[PDB]
């Protein structure tokens, strides 16, 4: 079976209980709700449909709420008509949202546009189709010189590479959506356009105010500012979503693949989930099979070491959602099959030298004894994520009494969570883990299993490794 | 400077001496002539233009002739009009080339169509857009059942995965083109649609009949048959071109990226050049910059270990040839920069244990002494290709008296060839190599260089490694 | 503190309770009783004296009974006088024990002498001083030609290298001595002149028949036959004593140091205790300090990897017994100090080796001063010791015999405990006793090794705790 | 064939040409002349006899001159009679060489005795048999308290461990003996009782002043002061002789074996020859075979990595000189056989070490029986030997002094050649001589190491050839 996990964005074609059951059969592990669209009734109904399928089938899945976030965009044009911009011309942006634009000027949604920019900065419009350079800033207007020919339409994205943008983390709509997430008991929140660590902290404080302290925050890295502040963002987050397509608008095109590899590697070292997203199998919105290029790009993200890959439009609004999940699962299985363990220590936190020494040792022992299974006891999921860091060949069966942890571990590479009533002692954990190893069908009589847990320590440390024959 | 080499297909927009000089400045190393188009006068003029630029500037480059090759294609339709094929319908192919097709039947160019196929085989038309299954074969007709809906146009490619096709290696036009290559003294021949080792042997015998015995044959792997026979094809060839897009028509889409990685790895182990080709920066035929996906795919082929990457339409007929070469060179430099040496022995030929032990040792010694340069003496190029196998950080300065070898080494990763008058002894090689190391500007006073050669042995063995301070 | 263990042969000068207490303070770990001499009353009194000291002081030690065994020796000469043998002369051995010898003939103690020998075999007399070659065998006489000049005295050792000797494993005296060992509850039996596997099995069956099935057998390798059959002897034994001096009589002198190194390495690999013995500090029988050569020889046996070193006459009858133990302990501590772990890796014991090797590797990566093992039969403690950990091994057991036997294993500190009811209870108790032992302090890492939900004989669990 | 080299001290029983030829056949590589005894006529005749044998047979050997050096000794007693010293008594040393000693006072040979000592220092007499402590120093007398009982005889060694002795490096006799060494063109000088770096420099300057600048200096480490200054002594020397017996008198006995191991390892790392000496096979002065202990001690010094082992009285005056060399060669061959290469890696010599280490690694990956080196001063041959190659080193040189000196280096077979005009000529000639040597045959791989377009002192080229 595959180890890499699949996040599927759910929309009208895939929201039914029948479709969700088939999505899970095809390899879906996590349902993404994109709050860029839909009202609370639709999203609530999607949550309920998945939970009904989970209850009926006994399958497990996680729910991830994805925030709309905040960006800069152009606004309206005369008669809604495109205007042709000529390289070398003057063109002006204004913060006055009432102004209707034309070939000479257009309004933007961000009032700080004049504050954050400076003469000489470069302004990008419509996913970097049109580049301009600021030549003057006066009152509510940013005067620019156009660099390349291009056609301007309405409501196009604006990108400011090399500039810090003082946009708040959460709009009012994002705050209400987060409260909805806490009321619904979602497992993850993915935050769009995370630019700096204070953005993550301000989401964390909102969730803690509404009973979501146990919800994991996945920061979406989508622009140059987020990439520059990656290390502080990761430290403050529970995980990362690499949004390759958005990032490629703002950084040099030859850097994008190295930004992805660097972010994935740091997430693995931090024992924090990483999702690779955007431009995965987009061609399958319209086509029943993907391109060679798409399949290769996905497989290379898996070889980079991603925990999970994500479908967006392919599953939300596309014509071939089940085909997209099936082929994605096929790529996952084909690629996972040829990956090896990474038994280097990679330990940077002295406070976790014990956990890392024991978990690394447990994977090395599993591999030398051909153990098909590592059984972990976990309360918060740390021990399972600490084992996964070394990319074991063995499947990780994670036993927990914490329902939230069981759901969240669905996103971690090669982890099979199992909710259990209780574990009263180390010896009881061995007894139960051997029974459930056999019941899971992931191991059989005579197989070696390695069992990992914390003994006479509180949650957050793993200090014990034990080898059993089933 | 980059190490990965760039093959550029030259066409009307890039054939002038002025353009060729700018192509070389931008990072072009090898000129590809695609004999699918153009007459002998055009190709002869392109060869002469490059050689004039080489003589005037003293820059070096190689010339690669790419054969049209042999394939199966459909033919004409009624009124030249597309017909819509419906899944589950009957559809017939005929070998009678005079028949004009319609929604029920079409002719194919291959007379062996009825011989090589069998009931139950799958037939693919137009880069696998329409799939069919053979239901009967009678006389000159292959009767099929259509599997998916699709529109059929005229002159579309036919693919027969899981079938061996008895097509000759060379058409009559290919034979004349090869003779032209020998008369022009081209450095490489790239052979399209190589299916088995006998195809390579039959090209080798044609070249040896026209004074082209020293021309290197690059086999193009473009279909399932060539991939299945890869090992025998490589053994008979001097190098490989991985044509990813063509291969993806016939094998499962999740296998393509592993076919590429496997072929590249085997070429490296065999000390034979490998080119990664097709679907590289195709978007730049129309756009002045490539996509994130394209840049990532190219970089991953370099991290796989390709000697060279190839531009096709981007340089031959596209609107932004110099932009395409520039960004390709930028991706090469960015990616080469972070690759490490591969100091594993990987020696499978007992007849070359000495060459591999000395060359591997020389790279290890270069890396431990921070030598920026490995100077190799070579007659046929083997010693330079044997050093390159270990991906040295150092540049390889390859000294030779053989003009053909000097040109061919332009395609090998990280090799800078230099034609010299003579080398009369090992000590004379050290004297000259130190002078030329300094003259090349690749090393300076006080730098360590490692110098590799064959002493008291004939061509084809490398047995000596020597460490000098400039 | 040293890790290598010291075996001391106890005799008249070292048998008092006062002396035994000082021997233990000086570094004695195991008492050897040499049953070549002394009666049951003397040996019983030495056992009683040591157990009194152990009870009074709470110090621990092991008791090893060393059998006399059987050998071939010449017998009496006319008027007790030496005779000079001339190279090239005829000389005859007879099995008739009544014959009084002379320059032409002497009797031997072994009746099978005529049976086991053949024309052309080599006979060695008096630690190989006189060599001869068999030229004929007739009735009860082995007729020989003398090879080198020498003087023959009375009661000299006879060696037949390259010949198998059909001497029983145990003489009747050895059988009675082993029964005494069982009566006394000794921890080890060292069997002299082990020649082959059947010898070990005969001892194992004899001990089992007299309630000594838990007594460990240390096979003494002293001759060429024992060395040739080493692999099967080790497999049947619980440990080995390398008797270098005796072995040097029968094999080429340049081979002796490699026989020692080979036997030690194989004992380590088998997780079986090995003692290096004979010619250790012999000069200290008469001198208050040893020679340079003796100190180097002892240190090299430790660097070879021996669990223990052994004093013979130096401690049993010598004039400087306490000095000999003190300098031996000093050599042990100086040499143990600079030795490193050996972390290189029976399909039946792949689990035990994987866990114990991993435990030592983890201990060293975390600078753990202590590995705490739970053990019933001592296997788990011996499995950890195989990798020469820097850390001390605190071995917790409820088995009194095991606690004593682990005294001989390198770097092992045994501690008898009332019980261990669960894996978590083992961690609780092991951390308490780690602190109580003074071998580790608050904040130190300890690695704790045990068998969970498996019977004795397998070690499957490793756990890391901060004290 | 063995790789470890054998130094033999030549005396009356081994000085004849007939004996020397048999010594070389038995495995002697280097002749030691001990200038503690004998006059220039005797030593000159031994040199002449060896060079005659070398000329007649074509065998090669090196000549090492060993200086007497300077030490402190007691002097005469009244009537030549021993006196018994009682622990706790007063006992006085005087620098007045005319005083005849008794149970209360004795003279010493060293006039600086009162200068170098201080109240509280320790004085050792007769190989440390009698210890004393300085209680006062007045004029020409050092007043002491005796620590242990002992009998004092005449002319006994005095040791002052933990004190620096201001004895000159060379006595006047040593200076004349070194001039003799220069006259005779000896290959090595071994300097007794080297205490510090200035001693080595004084010898180096003395040899340079008498045409001996090409003579290699082997510093003898025999006491505590020399051992403390070892690093600077090695740096100034061409090699080291580890005199274990003498060193055992002044440092704690458990340290001697580690001083040996440390000095050998540092000599290897410095690419400088090391000799292990004293207490090697001493029992063979009287016996036709050595002891188990002696054989093991010699083998462990070889496993430590010594270039050479040395016979003293065993070859100079003993009753079994040929037997001693034969068994020593047997130990060498048996021990060298099982040793492995050490392929682990001065910024000025990074190139030489990278090429020579690589050459040994390549030789072993291709099963090359032979590494052929071109050398002027011997550095390149010694640089390859540092990695303990399995292959024999055939060292081609035009320097006669170098050819002789390489006889002392482990596993090196030197061969004098007329000339080497180029790198390609070196390969041509080396392949011919590889075949002629009988050390390699048609189809064998050889690795050939040399300096190309660099002066002496750097090795930069490695080349692989099939014979």
In short:
Chains C, D: One of its GO terms (molecular function) is ATP binding. The structure is a homotetramer. The first copy, chain A, is of the alpha/beta class.
Helix content percent band of chain A: 25-40%
Shape of chain A: elongated
In CATH, what is the homologous superfamily of the domain at 72-159 in chain A?
PK beta-barrel domain-like
Number of strands of chain A: 22
* Spatial strand arrangement across the major sheet of chain A: 1-2-3-13-14-15-16-17
CATH topology of the domain at 72-159 in chain A: M1 Pyruvate Kinase, Domain 3
Major beta sheet of chain A, specifics? Answer: 8 strands, parallel, barrel
Question: Largest interface, and how many residues on either side?
Answer: A-B, 31 and 31 residues
From the N-terminal CA to the C-terminal CA of chain A, the straight-line distance is 21 Å
H/I helix tally of chain A: 16
Q: Radius of gyration of chain A, rounded? A: 24 Å
Strand content of chain A: 15-25%
CATH class division of the domain at 72-159 in chain A: Mainly Beta
PDB class: transferase
Keywords: Pyruvate kinase, Long term evolution experiment, Kinase, transferase
Assembly: tetrameric
Entry title: Escherichia coli pyruvate kinase (PykF) P70Q
Model description:
- The structure is a homotetramer.
- Chain A has 470 residues and is α/β, with parallel strands linked by helices.
- Chain A has a domain at 72-159: Beta Barrel (M1 Pyruvate Kinase, Domain 3).
- Helices cover 36% and strands 22% of the residues of chain A.
- The first copy, chain A, is built from 16 helices and 22 strands.
- Chain A has helices at residues 17-26, 40-57, 113-116, 172-184, 197-208, 224-228, 230-236, 244-250, 256-269, 292-304, 313-316, 321-336, 353-368, 382-388, 403-408, 426-440, and strands spanning 5-9, 30-34, 62-66, 72-73, 83-85, 90-94, 105-107, 122-125, 130-138, 141-146, 150-152, 157-159, 188-191, 216-221, 239-243, 273-277, 308-311, 373-377, 395-400, 415-419, 448-453, 464-469.
- Chain A has an eight-stranded parallel barrel with strand order 1-2-3-13-14-15-16-17, surrounded by eight helices.
- The longest helix of chain A is centred in the N-terminal third of the chain and has 18 residues, at 40-57.
- Chains in contact: A-B, A-C, B-D, C-D.
- Chain A binds chain B through residues 148, 244-245, 247-248, 253-258, 260, 279, 288-297, 299-300, 327, 330-331, 334-335, 338, and chain B through 148, 244-245, 247-248, 253-258, 260, 279, 288-297, 299-300, 327, 330-331, 334-335, 338.
- Strand 22 of chain A pairs antiparallel with strand 22 of chain C, so a sheet runs across the interface.
- Chains C, D: It catalyses: pyruvate + ATP = phosphoenolpyruvate + ADP + H(+).
